[PDB]
Amino acid sequence: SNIIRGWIFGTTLDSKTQSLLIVNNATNVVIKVCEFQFCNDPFLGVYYH
Amino acid sequence: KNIDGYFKIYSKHTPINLVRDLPQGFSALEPLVDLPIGINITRFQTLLA
Amino acid sequence: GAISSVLNDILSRLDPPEAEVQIDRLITGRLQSLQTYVTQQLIRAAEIR
Amino acid sequence: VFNATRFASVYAWNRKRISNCVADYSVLYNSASFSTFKCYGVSPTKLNDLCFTNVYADSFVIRGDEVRQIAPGQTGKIADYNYKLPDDFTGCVIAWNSNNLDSKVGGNYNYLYRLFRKSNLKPFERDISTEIYQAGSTPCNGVEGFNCYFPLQSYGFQPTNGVGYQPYRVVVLSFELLHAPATVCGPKKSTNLVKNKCVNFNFNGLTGTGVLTESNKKFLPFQQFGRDIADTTDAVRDPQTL
Amino acid sequence: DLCFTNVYADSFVIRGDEVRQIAPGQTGKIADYNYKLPDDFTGCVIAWN
Amino acid sequence: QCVNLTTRTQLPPAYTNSFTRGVYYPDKVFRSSVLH
Numbered sequence A: 001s002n003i004i005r006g007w008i009f010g011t012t013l014d015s016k017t018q019s020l021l022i023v024n025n026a027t028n029v030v031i032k033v034c035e036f037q038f039c040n041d042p043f044l045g046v047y048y049h
Numbered sequence B: 001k002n003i004d005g006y007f008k009i010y011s012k013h014t015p016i017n018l019v020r021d022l023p024q025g026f027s028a029l030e031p032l033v034d035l036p037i038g039i040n041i042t043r044f045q046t047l048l049a
Numbered sequence C: 001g002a003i004s005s006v007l008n009d010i011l012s013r014l015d016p017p018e019a020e021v022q023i024d025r026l027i028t029g030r031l032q033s034l035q036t037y038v039t040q041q042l043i044r045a046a047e048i049r
Numbered sequence D: 001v002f003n004a005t006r007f008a009s010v011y012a013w014n015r016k017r018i019s020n021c022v023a024d025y026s027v028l029y030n031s032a033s034f035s036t037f038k039c040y041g042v043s044p045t046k047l048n049d050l051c052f053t054n055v056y057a058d059s060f061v062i063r064g065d066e067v068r069q070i071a072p073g074q075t076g077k078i079a080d081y082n083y084k085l086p087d088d089f090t091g092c093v094i095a096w097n098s099n100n101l102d103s104k105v106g107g108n109y110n111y112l113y114r115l116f117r118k119s120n121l122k123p124f125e126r127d128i129s130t131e132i133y134q135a136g137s138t139p140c141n142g143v144e145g146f147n148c149y150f151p152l153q154s155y156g157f158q159p160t161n162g163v164g165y166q167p168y169r170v171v172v173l174s175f176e177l178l179h180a181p182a183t184v185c186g187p188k189k190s191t192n193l194v195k196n197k198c199v200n201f202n203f204n205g206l207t208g209t210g211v212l213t214e215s216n217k218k219f220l221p222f223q224q225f226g227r228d229i230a231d232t233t234d235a236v237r238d239p240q241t242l
Numbered sequence E: 001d002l003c004f005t006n007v008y009a010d011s012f013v014i015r016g017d018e019v020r021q022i023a024p025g026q027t028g029k030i031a032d033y034n035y036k037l038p039d040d041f042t043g044c045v046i047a048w049n
Numbered sequence F: 001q002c003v004n005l006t007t008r009t010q011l012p013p014a015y016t017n018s019f020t021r022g023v024y025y026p027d028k029v030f031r032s033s034v035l036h
Helices: C007-013 C023-048
Strands: A007-010 A019-024 A029-034 B006-011 B030-035 B043-046 D014-018 D034-039 D055-063 D091-097 D112-114 D152-154 D167-174 D198-203 D206-211 D225-227 D233-235 F029-031
Touching (some): C007 D206
Antiparallel strands (some): A007 A019, D198 D206
């Protein structure tokens, strides 16, 4: 069901370091290297079927 | 893997028929892209839907 | 001990000032291989004779 | 890349992917300023004969005293701390002077550098972290103080300083070579393809003597060169037509 | 201690950025175009301001 | 973003065997009927 969406590759998983974020938002394969505000539980949900 | 600041990814997709524990088989993984991320990766997570 | 095993790579990469450092490593590696092989043949020919 | 307006700093340096173009270094000789020019893994006379797969330009501005630090196997505040080159670095280093543009009368504080780093990071790595370095035993808690120094300082960029203190621009080229399909190849005109005759072939810079025949081998789309037991190139792929 | 047979002086004036180009196996507007040194060049290069 | 899930059940990290997984092409080079 395409549940694996991507990863977050970082050092400390925080804004104190530079991290990789490879995801897929069902349109484009998004690969970004930014200073991310890391959430404790990243997810992408589908709603109200 | 991230060695010498050169993130190598290797992708392989094949159809399977599986309920349970990882199948006894073989598949040669092929490189898709090459990402010059230039970071340090020690910890990571995985997105789910 | 050289940067590569192929003679055609060093002829396509390095100058003859920098290739004689590298090709003479290939020549010595191939001559010692032949001096290995002729040693293995003469001892074997002494066994057959 | 070489004639841009403003470069980036050394801790965060722009890495523009050079793909699908003609590597002609004779265009740069109209306005040439190249002070040092060293290719460690390759030779500069083969730049027109040999061509490269994935050319990456490493553009940043540092102090003129630390240009020799950009080398595989050196240290410094540039080499050991933020911009490290690999041990197997097969590439070229192109650097030149920038007194006429990057020197300000008052001072150019926009070009920062990393002076305090905790450990020895991996080569080809960028570091945009602005965390306060802990030089002592007390926790810094993200503020400055005793043994708590801000890691990003700036050089003195004035045209009246010493020439070793003057900012030198630098662009370093890195590539994978003779294993991958080549996208960037320079202004050497290709010739006709001759089959069933012993010729002197040149495929993506790889020169040698061989016979070109058709085959039933089907290469993968990421594969260019076919090799043998003896490790020599047994088959290539035509980059123009499939 | 060693002395030489046919010493030839190569006297000219170029830009200060291109002095390292005078070497066996380099390029430039001086090395590649008009003043080229041989691959088997056994000699000395003396330059000054 | 900051809101975490509440249906997470603490379960022990069990172990799994792999048969022959983890093999990739080390470079971009074609090879035919060889053992490299």
